[PDB]
Write a protein that binds this ligand. Structure first.
Ligand SMILES: C=CC1=C(C)[C@@H](Cc2[nH]c(/C=C3N=C(/C=C4\NC(=O)[C@H](C)[C@H]4CC)C(C)=C\3CCC(=O)O)c(CCC(=O)O)c2C)NC1=O
Ligand SMILES: C=CC1=C(C)[C@@H](Cc2[nH]c(/C=C3N=C(/C=C4\NC(=O)[C@H](C)[C@H]4CC)C(C)=C\3CCC(=O)O)c(CCC(=O)O)c2C)NC1=O
Ligand SMILES: C=CC1=C(C)[C@@H](Cc2[nH]c(/C=C3N=C(/C=C4\NC(=O)[C@H](C)[C@H]4CC)C(C)=C\3CCC(=O)O)c(CCC(=O)O)c2C)NC1=O
Ligand SMILES: C=CC1=C(C)[C@@H](Cc2[nH]c(/C=C3N=C(/C=C4\NC(=O)[C@H](C)[C@H]4CC)C(C)=C\3CCC(=O)O)c(CCC(=O)O)c2C)NC1=O
Ligand SMILES: C=CC1=C(C)[C@@H](Cc2[nH]c(/C=C3N=C(/C=C4\NC(=O)[C@H](C)[C@H]4CC)C(C)=C\3CCC(=O)O)c(CCC(=O)O)c2C)NC1=O
Ligand SMILES: C=CC1=C(C)[C@@H](Cc2[nH]c(/C=C3N=C(/C=C4\NC(=O)[C@H](C)[C@H]4CC)C(C)=C\3CCC(=O)O)c(CCC(=O)O)c2C)NC1=O
Ligand SMILES: C=CC1=C(C)[C@@H](Cc2[nH]c(/C=C3N=C(/C=C4\NC(=O)[C@H](C)[C@H]4CC)C(C)=C\3CCC(=O)O)c(CCC(=O)O)c2C)NC1=O
Ligand SMILES: C=CC1=C(C)[C@@H](Cc2[nH]c(/C=C3N=C(/C=C4\NC(=O)[C@H](C)[C@H]4CC)C(C)=C\3CCC(=O)O)c(CCC(=O)O)c2C)NC1=O
Ligand SMILES: C=CC1=C(C)[C@@H](Cc2[nH]c(/C=C3N=C(/C=C4\NC(=O)[C@H](C)[C@H]4CC)C(C)=C\3CCC(=O)O)c(CCC(=O)O)c2C)NC1=O
Ligand SMILES: C=CC1=C(C)[C@@H](Cc2[nH]c(/C=C3N=C(/C=C4\NC(=O)[C@H](C)[C@H]4CC)C(C)=C\3CCC(=O)O)c(CCC(=O)O)c2C)NC1=O
Ligand SMILES: C=CC1=C(C)[C@@H](Cc2[nH]c(/C=C3N=C(/C=C4\NC(=O)[C@H](C)[C@H]4CC)C(C)=C\3CCC(=O)O)c(CCC(=O)O)c2C)NC1=O
Ligand SMILES: CCC1=C(C)[C@@H](CC2=N/C(=C\c3[nH]c(C[C@@H]4NC(=O)C(C)=C4CC)c(C)c3CCC(=O)O)C(CCC(=O)O)=C2C)NC1=O
Ligand SMILES: CCC1=C(C)[C@@H](CC2=N/C(=C\c3[nH]c(C[C@@H]4NC(=O)C(C)=C4CC)c(C)c3CCC(=O)O)C(CCC(=O)O)=C2C)NC1=O
Ligand SMILES: CCC1=C(C)[C@@H](CC2=N/C(=C\c3[nH]c(C[C@@H]4NC(=O)C(C)=C4CC)c(C)c3CCC(=O)O)C(CCC(=O)O)=C2C)NC1=O
Lengths: 177, 164, 331, 164, 177, 164, 177
């Protein structure tokens, strides 16, 4: 695992050079954007099982063939493992938002997963559908635009961070497809 | 690599939990001590050359027997090995100073140093002489700030206590 | 129970349940059935946590590793390693325990024997101090021992009692101190609960321990601690000594008898129901015909060394006080 | 029990190292968020009674079917069980709120809740109704502080997401 | 493991009430004394190998019978385990200074240690001697009065905390004897 | 899939010894109780529709609160999900009823029922209302047979005790 | 693992309907043929080590190269493992006769075996020879036509079941080749 700090150090490490000015200045922007990232991860962590609920229910409600007999959601067991997979995807996404770098996701969740599914037969476009719903759902929670929970936050602009989280979810969705 | 971020992600991950408010307080502390650490990193990145030159020159202002028979003084090349090793050390103090744990400094520099230093007959005491020289030669209000100085001293202390 | 009767002396030692063995015999990934695996999974928790209690909340911990056993990822060797690295296993066994309590547990969980000599303890503690915790766990798993006995598809079992992994007779007796039959788990079992090292003094010096069967007679007996006399000055009244040297070996061999439940209410002086010192309620024994408030037996569980010709008499007196006999081994 | 202190001490302990400066930055953040969490703990210790009365009264402002046949409404006793359960919950929100991690609330309350709630036929949804009521009924500068309100909401969220 | 926060929580939990204002006030004094505790732990952690060096070298140099043939420091292996024992004692003491509570040390380091040293043949009075040397040497480093290393700290009073660390080391020295 | 055959072959296979006379007695018992079980499977295959209709209509003859706000009553569609879930349950009662162990019912239906029912906010109590209704609505010599009814009750009891 | 029952239930489960009368009628024929299957499996279990004796001794005495120096039966150890392998093949065939379905044998004994013998270097035509000897020997024991033991049984015809056991052995012999 590597955060933003570690990535600056690894990239600067190859040339055997010190942190310098520019890299540290971009990382100063990370620190000043710190609390926004903190409260953002609090927004995605709170109501996260509700994200997984809405996402998978939307995946079945959009594509009714999964619950059709012989589908990959068709069994109570299968639905359990389905919900857990959504939960673990969101889990490592949450860690990628804390770290500010996709190292934990790439090294730990992303690896081996496309092939695991191929053996399983899990439909990959349905998984990328569920990942997309967790993406939009997660960005709507992160922008205080949830139609059910519009909680109090310090007022500001955080479009950078929304683009960041959308980059991680698009990394998972491109990883399964 | 031990930082606050990787420790709490790794620990929360070992729990199997989403990251709770405790980790959030820990990274809150990281962004609290950040400015001090980065200040020290800036000034180290500033005058690293004269740092390594006075460190090595002071390392042979102590033990002169090295350049004798030979242990390690038998070329300008081996003394260049000396100053490049001190270059690597200040480079890792810079790296750890950025990250803010002794993680990078430990996993790159410290881990497995002992078998190399006993295998290539490199005495560790001379390194100690260099670093204790630099650690003795900072300035309290003259360089950085009370808080940055402390951070720098901490990292470099870790090096000496990892080496002796 | 009884070592004869049905021929199976070991089962009645409490180790009858642990015969069940669990080797995956199915090659290729499971899809759907999840019966056999959920059994093998459950047996892994029964071995590794040693019958500790894990809940739905606690089934969320290690859910990922659990979902990797079910896939072509982990052998049960490597799954057992993955259960041994996790948050839970550290909470229970490592964080509460001392490095030697913890070492002894790790052999009960991973190999199912006890450590015999101090050399095992030195090796594993040194691996710990050089590298930390995860390489500690690897150093159990990553050795010839586990690979040979289990072969990576067998869930670990108790083999410390068996004669086939040789060990020492100390590791036999120590085997039964560590396992007390099916209910007792690492947290639950007395003298191994939480932090206390299950057997330090015994485990370090390879002292054979008399084996007391579960249930039966004095199941609830824990040995009284001894100090070392002059050097490192220590109390000299607490227990009978394991050795008995002689000129009292006359009158027949010395029997080290352990008595197990001593109590005021139980101690009667041979005559039924509690005797009253004063006319109105005063029950402790009078010192010099003055009321004392000191328990007649002071710390449940005193031992007795008794030569053979005094056995019967001693055997009577314990039963007079209602003390119950744990184990009687010739010394 | 998960706090910042026990996480970093436990982690660095599991490494086998002395506590380095990274842990110290984490507990530096703990002493930064401390006053906000303790403020919220103080106010909850202030008005806990009315909190639990409005929580239970809102729980039966929703589902009335509980007090019918009976599921759990068959006495003033069972409704006393209701208000004492929410007393335990706000008391654990107070405990976790003091410590500052969801440690105590998880190990006292949440660990093994579901087998009890499925075993004693207790619907958890009514708890959810109570806590989402209280969680909706904060006040930003009217009740505590920007950071305290956030801390309180976080703890209560954890409860609901542990339960739903 | 339990810090000072956990001790307040457990005591108030057996008391079965809310934490309340009063306990919290003493814990506010803990938080305001926080940075002194931070710099104190930094003082004991820095130059700690040097503390173990001075302590055990003092234990041998005062009592020369340990290194005599037949002593418990007499073997090179034995001297190794001796040095490590000093290191681990000071390690858990350092944890007890961060936590502000002796829970880690009592549950983990303190328990069964007299019967272990007795069980090995280690002289207990000599161990309490070495623990005492680490005590005084650690308090002299924590008060910036070290004759070799007098580093810069902003000036104040920290007698509370010195009494605390002395309480931990006296707990260990009474624990081995 | 837990049946007498799979149990004894699995056990004697685990032992590693040819199937002895004991397993032969076990499958002897299986072919003894066979006709009773299949009789009940035939009649369940007969009248499954009215079974599920009375089960769901009795489930809402109890708790009406589901179709209120909404918990689960907000469409004719979700109530169709109700009747299809009871269709799946009677389909697995039919399957287990054929096999003669609670194996198929456990591996298809029961394994992992809880994560779904706590996650997607499904109260189990209403399932219990349905099954206890059908279990109360047998007829001893009027419906099937002494053996067939008992068999049916056993299966259904397993369902309820797996759910409550 | 799946018996006849399980296979009817699984096929009707992908068919997604109730079991129904028709499948049930064929399974009633299974039940009425029950005791013939029972006594058949008793016939194969009794005198089975004698089957493996005769089979492997016939496999060596047909093909004398195995016992020739450098063959796969040439070592005393190798002869041990040879005998055991024949025993295990016979074992799972006996289980496939009890279950009335080849699921135990296909999932457990048949899978990975061709790849294993190849890795071992075990000659595959020789194994299919030994499987063939166990086939015809086992059918002659199951039909009470054995030249050494013609034991007393209730009178009847069991050609169905002989065809079944021959199908299991042909499945293993085709599986190794
Ligand atoms: C660390 C990351 C990580 C993941 C991302 C998952 C990925 C994953 N999923 C499954 C396994 C599974 N995953 C699903 C999920 C699905 N159900 C469907 O209807 C959808 C197509 C899909 C959800 C969108 C199902 C149903 C199974 C079980 C498949 C089966 O047994 O048939 C398995 C095999 C092991 C198991 O059975 O659990 C793995 C490795 N596991 C991990 O360790
Ligand atoms: C320990 C836990 C912890 C947190 C949870 C955060 C909470 C936090 N957020 C902000 C502050 C803020 N938080 C947000 C966040 C956003 N505003 C929007 O309108 C979006 C909905 C949302 C996107 C994430 C913004 C925009 C600010 C103010 C801008 C800024 O401070 O950068 C501040 C500054 C102080 C104050 O406002 O009083 C703090 C402490 N920090 C922490 O230390
Ligand atoms: C990333 C960090 C990093 C370091 C810190 C160095 C450390 C290091 N130094 C040497 C190797 C060496 N280092 C020195 C240095 C010394 N000469 C003396 O007189 C003094 C005692 C001392 C300088 C103070 C010498 C002389 C060698 C060569 C030794 C030999 O070949 O005899 C080697 C072996 C490989 C080599 O020959 O270069 C390594 C790993 N290398 C790294 O990659
Ligand atoms: C009937 C036979 C019989 C014996 C043979 C002794 C054996 C014996 N010695 C000691 C006890 C002792 N024995 C010694 C003797 C030793 N001092 C050393 O420097 C040498 C290694 C060694 C003499 C050669 C010492 C020093 C003690 C006291 C140990 C202590 O308290 O630390 C004890 C424990 C009780 C006690 O403290 O006296 C016993 C049973 N006792 C018996 O009843
Ligand atoms: C320590 C934590 C803590 C809380 C979470 C609150 C919770 C709380 N709020 C109220 C009570 C109240 N809370 C509010 C707040 C407001 N109502 C509105 O409609 C506005 C939107 C909102 C301000 C933003 C109001 C107006 C009342 C009184 C009337 C009411 O119940 O709404 C009460 C009853 C006692 C009283 O009247 O004060 C309680 C227990 N109190 C605490 O001590
Ligand atoms: C330490 C934390 C802690 C808790 C949180 C509680 C949780 C809890 N509640 C009950 C038990 C109970 N809890 C309730 C409460 C309810 N009544 C309803 O109408 C509502 C659905 C709900 C209140 C919102 C009831 C009614 C019972 C008794 C249930 C019964 O006996 O039928 C029990 C079983 C023991 C008992 O009967 O008391 C437990 C463990 N107990 C604890 O020790
Ligand atoms: C991450 C690492 C880390 C540390 C190592 C500490 C370092 C630290 N110490 C103080 C501050 C201080 N530190 C000390 C300490 C003492 N003074 C004495 O004269 C005694 C010798 C010594 C006993 C321990 C005192 C007295 C203060 C000032 C009083 C106070 O702030 O409480 C401050 C306040 C800010 C400042 O002074 O600029 C900081 C950040 N905090 C951290 O976050
Ligand atoms: C093989 C067995 C098997 C089952 C037993 C079911 C169980 C089951 N039900 C639902 C899903 C559902 N089940 C119900 C049923 C209910 N409506 C209520 O008012 C009552 C509480 C209850 C009937 C008694 C509803 C309403 C949903 C949809 C829930 C929702 O989307 O909100 C789902 C999620 C997928 C889906 O939406 O269909 C599953 C797995 N499915 C299976 O494959
Ligand atoms: C496959 C499983 C299966 C069942 C479990 C039953 C269940 C069942 N029973 C009835 C219907 C009935 N069940 C009974 C049975 C009796 N009522 C009494 O009061 C007696 C005590 C008891 C006989 C012992 C009766 C009398 C009816 C018709 C009237 C009624 O509802 O009670 C109905 C409605 C259709 C009808 O009228 O037949 C259904 C679905 N049917 C099935 O096909
Ligand atoms: C569960 C099912 C199952 C099987 C079917 C066997 C299959 C099998 N056979 C062997 C291993 C073996 N199998 C044979 C058998 C042969 N000797 C010959 O002359 C013939 C070609 C052939 C008998 C027809 C021999 C000789 C070995 C040992 C090979 C060697 O070590 O050289 C091995 C490797 C492990 C071992 O040495 O035992 C395995 C997995 N094992 C199982 O677990
Ligand atoms: C527990 C052990 C156990 C067994 C070993 C069997 C033994 C057994 N076989 C039959 C009964 C029978 N057994 C056979 C078997 C055959 N007849 C032939 O001529 C062939 C040689 C042979 C092929 C396998 C036949 C044909 C019957 C009678 C037909 C039938 O009952 O299906 C019966 C019926 C009762 C009776 O005949 O008195 C029983 C109990 N059953 C058991 O429970
Ligand atoms: C009929 C079958 C069906 C569904 C099921 C939904 C599922 C759904 N939710 C979405 C997206 C979505 N879902 C939620 C979560 C959700 N909203 C809340 O305010 C609360 C409290 C929630 C959990 C209870 C949010 C927050 C969003 C983002 C959009 C928004 O701002 O609401 C999106 C948009 C995806 C995208 O942007 O690519 C879809 C498709 N849609 C369907 O057609
Ligand atoms: C001959 C066998 C022998 C020893 C070995 C020493 C060991 C020793 N060090 C002490 C105490 C001691 N030791 C040090 C640490 C030490 N000093 C420094 O300045 C630096 C850099 C150090 C590590 C290299 C300090 C700082 C003190 C406190 C006294 C002081 O101010 O120096 C004390 C006093 C204990 C007490 O106060 O109770 C002793 C006995 N003494 C012996 O008789
Ligand atoms: C000279 C090298 C040599 C051998 C070794 C045998 C081996 C052998 N046994 C057979 C077959 C065979 N073997 C037995 C088992 C055997 N018979 C019994 O009655 C008892 C008690 C037995 C174990 C002691 C039976 C029961 C049969 C079936 C034929 C029969 O009815 O006897 C068959 C026929 C295979 C087939 O049908 O394809 C062969 C080749 N043949 C050889 O040429």
């Amino acid at each position: 695992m590597l955060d933003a700090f570690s990535r600056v150090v690894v990239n600067s490490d190859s040339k055997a050079a010190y942190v310098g000015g520019s890299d540290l200045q971009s990382l100063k922007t990370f620190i000043s954007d710190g609390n926004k990232r903190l409260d953002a991860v609090n927004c995605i962590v709170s109501n996260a099982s509700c994200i997984v609920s809405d996402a998978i229910s939307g995946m079945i409600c959009e594509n009714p063939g999964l619950i059709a007999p012989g589908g990959n959601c068709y069994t109570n067991r299968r639905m359990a493992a389905c919900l857990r997979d959504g939960e673990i995807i969101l889990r490592y996404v949450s860690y990628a938002l804390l770290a500010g770098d996709s190292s934990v996701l790439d090294d730990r969740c992303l690896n081996g997963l496309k092939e695991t599914y191929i053996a399983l037969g899990v439909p990959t476009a349905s998984t990328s559908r569920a990942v997309s719903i967790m993406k939009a759902a997660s960005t709507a929670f992160i922008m205080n635009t949830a139609s059910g929970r519009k909680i109090e936050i310090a007022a500001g602009d955080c479009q950078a961070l929304q683009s960041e989280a959308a980059a991680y979810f698009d990394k998972v969705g491109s990883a399964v497809d | 690599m031990k930082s606050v971020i990787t420790t709490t992600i790794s620990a929360a991950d070992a729990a199997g939990r989403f990251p709770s408010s405790s980790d959030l307080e820990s990274i809150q502390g990281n962004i609290q001590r950040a400015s001090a650490r980065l200040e020290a990193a800036e000034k180290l990145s500033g005058n690293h050359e004269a740092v390594v030159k006075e460190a090595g020159d002071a390392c042979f202002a102590k033990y002169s027997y090295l350049k004798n028979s030979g242990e390690a003084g038998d070329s300008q090349e081996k003394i260049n090995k000396c100053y490049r090793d001190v270059d690597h050390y200040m480079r890792l103090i810079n790296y750890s100073l950025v990250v803010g744990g002794t993680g990078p400094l430990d996993e790159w520099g410290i881990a497995g140093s002992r078998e190399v230093y006993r295998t290539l007959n490199l005495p560790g005491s001379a390194y100690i002489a260099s670093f204790t020289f630099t650690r003795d030669r900072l300035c309290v209000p003259r360089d950085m700030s009370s808080q940055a100085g402390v951070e720098f001293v901490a990292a470099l202390d870790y090096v000496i206590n990892s080496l002796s | 129970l009884g070592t004869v009767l049905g021929n199976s002396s070991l089962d009645k030692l409490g180790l009858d349940k642990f015969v069940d063995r669990f080797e995956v015999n199915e090659a290729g990934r499971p899809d759907g059935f999840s019966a056999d695996y959920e059994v093998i999974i459950r047996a892994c928790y029964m071995q590794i946590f040693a019958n500790a209690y894990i809940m739905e909340s606690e089934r969320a911990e290690m859910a990922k590793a659990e979902s990797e056993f079910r896939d072509g990822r982990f052998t049960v060797k490597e799954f057992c390693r993955a259960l041994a690295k996790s948050y839970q296993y550290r909470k229970r066994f490592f964080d509460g325990r001392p490095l030697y309590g913890a070492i002894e547990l790790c052999f009960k969980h991973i190999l199912g024997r006890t450590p015999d000599g101090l050399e095992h303890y030195r090796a594993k503690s040194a691996v710990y101090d050089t590298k930390g915790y995860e390489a500690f766990i690897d150093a159990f798993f990553d050795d010839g021992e586990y690979d040979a006995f289990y072969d990576s598809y067998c869930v670990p079992f108790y083999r410390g009692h068996l004669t086939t992994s040789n060990l020492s007779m100390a590791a036999f007796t120590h085997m039964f101190q560590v396992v007390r039959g099916s209910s007792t788990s690492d947290k639950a079992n007395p003298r191994t609960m939480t932090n206390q090292i299950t057997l330090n003094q015994a485990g370090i010096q390879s002292i054979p321990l008399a084996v007391v069967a579960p249930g039966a007679d004095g199941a609830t007996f824990l040995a009284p601690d001894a100090s070392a006399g002059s050097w490192q000055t220590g109390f000299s009244g607490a227990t009978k000594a394991r050795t008995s040297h002689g000129s009292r070996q006359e009158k027949g061999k010395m029997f080290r008898i352990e008595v197990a439940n001593n109590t005021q209410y139980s101690a009667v002086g041979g005559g039924s129901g509690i005797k009253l010192q004063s006319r109105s309620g005063k029950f402790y024994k009078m010192r010099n015909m003055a009321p004392a408030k000191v328990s007649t037996f002071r710390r449940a569980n005193n031992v007795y060394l008794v030569p053979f010709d005094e056995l019967s008499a001693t055997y009577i007196k314990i039963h007079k006080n209602g003390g119950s006999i744990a184990s009687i081994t010739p010394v």
